[PDB]
Amino acid sequence: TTTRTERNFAGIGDVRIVYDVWTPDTAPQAVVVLAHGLGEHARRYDHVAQRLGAAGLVTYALDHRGHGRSGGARVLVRDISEYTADFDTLVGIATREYPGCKRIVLGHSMGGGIVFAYGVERPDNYDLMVLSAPAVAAQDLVSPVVAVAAKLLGVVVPGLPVQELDFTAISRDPEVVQAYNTDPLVHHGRVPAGIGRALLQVGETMPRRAPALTAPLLVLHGTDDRLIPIEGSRRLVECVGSADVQLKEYPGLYHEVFNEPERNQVLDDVVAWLTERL
């Protein structure tokens, strides 16, 4: 049994950041710091924390600024460092609360871009990294027109919409799409210029930032992901410095491998990979 506690901290700019702490009834084996993606929130991850908790892992999961229960204007960010600062604050909380535990940083989609960016900025500050369909090559996802728009407007007008998103691509389970579409806490609008620029910051410098990743890395990616082409992940595992790196491709899964029908196998793979590296 894994028990959820809700807490908050002051993120950068005094924005109120809400986060969950999931704690199991076994001696802590490691802490997991988890970053969700664009327009969603940490309560879309209840089942991931419960499965991690069954392996004795304590999961910390924040609602990014502008998401979920956290403060700030919805999906507003002006620089990638806003997201990574707040992620770093939560890493510190978990580090002070469970010293002597290994530290796993886990991120999906935009959260995967945030965790990669954090990781190359602080290569020595975590032990294991796990990325679900990481958004590390957004420049391959937007047109040249969208790219210049985001790069020129993302600091002055970070809420300006630049890019539509196909939400039916997040999962091939209709119930998952429907649950996303009816969630009053998720973003149903377009991709804003702010997040676009912030993700472009990550993508443009990924090939030379990545050799600074030394810690072990696991990447998960569905082959039918039409939100983030799997090719991006293949390219990332070639650029990372880490010798212990694997890409697990799941044939036929859509973008959110953790919400797909096969999610229990995906999570079984994650738990196995993590458990044997503690």
Numbering used by the authors: 2 to 279
Reproduce, without paraphrasing, sentences from the article in which this PDB structure was first reported:
One of those enzymes is the mycobacterial monoacylglycerol lipase Rv0183, also termed mtbMGL, hydrolyzing monoacylglycerol (MG) into glycerol and an unesterified fatty acid (FA). The biochemical characterization of mtbMGL showed a strong preference for monoacylglycerols (MG) and suggests it as a secreted lipase. mtbMGL belongs to the family of serine hydrolases, with an α/β-hydrolase core fold and a distinct cap domain. In this work, we determined the crystal structures of a surface-entropy reduced variant K74A Rv0183/mtbMGL in its free form and in complex with a substrate mimicking inhibitor.
Without the substrate analog, mtbMGL K74A crystallized in a completely closed cap conformation. The first α-helix between the residues P145 and V157 distorts and closes the entrance to the cavity leading to the active site by a distortion of the helix and a large movement of the N-terminal part towards the adjacent loop region. At the N-terminal end of the cap domain, the loop leading to the first helix forms a single turn of a 310-helix in both structures of mtbMGL K74A. In the closed-cap conformation, this leads to the contacts of cap helix 1 with the consecutive loop region (Gly160–Gln164). In the structure of mtbMGL K74A with a closed-cap conformation, the additional electron density in the active site cavity was explained by 2-propanol, originating from the crystallization condition. In the closed or complexed structure of mtbMGL K74A, this hole is closed or very narrow, due to an inward orientation of L166, which would correspond to the gating residue of Ile145 in bMGL or Ile178 in human MGL. A permanently closed cap is highly unlikely since mtbMGL K74A is still catalytically active and crystallized in complex with the substrate analog Maglipan.
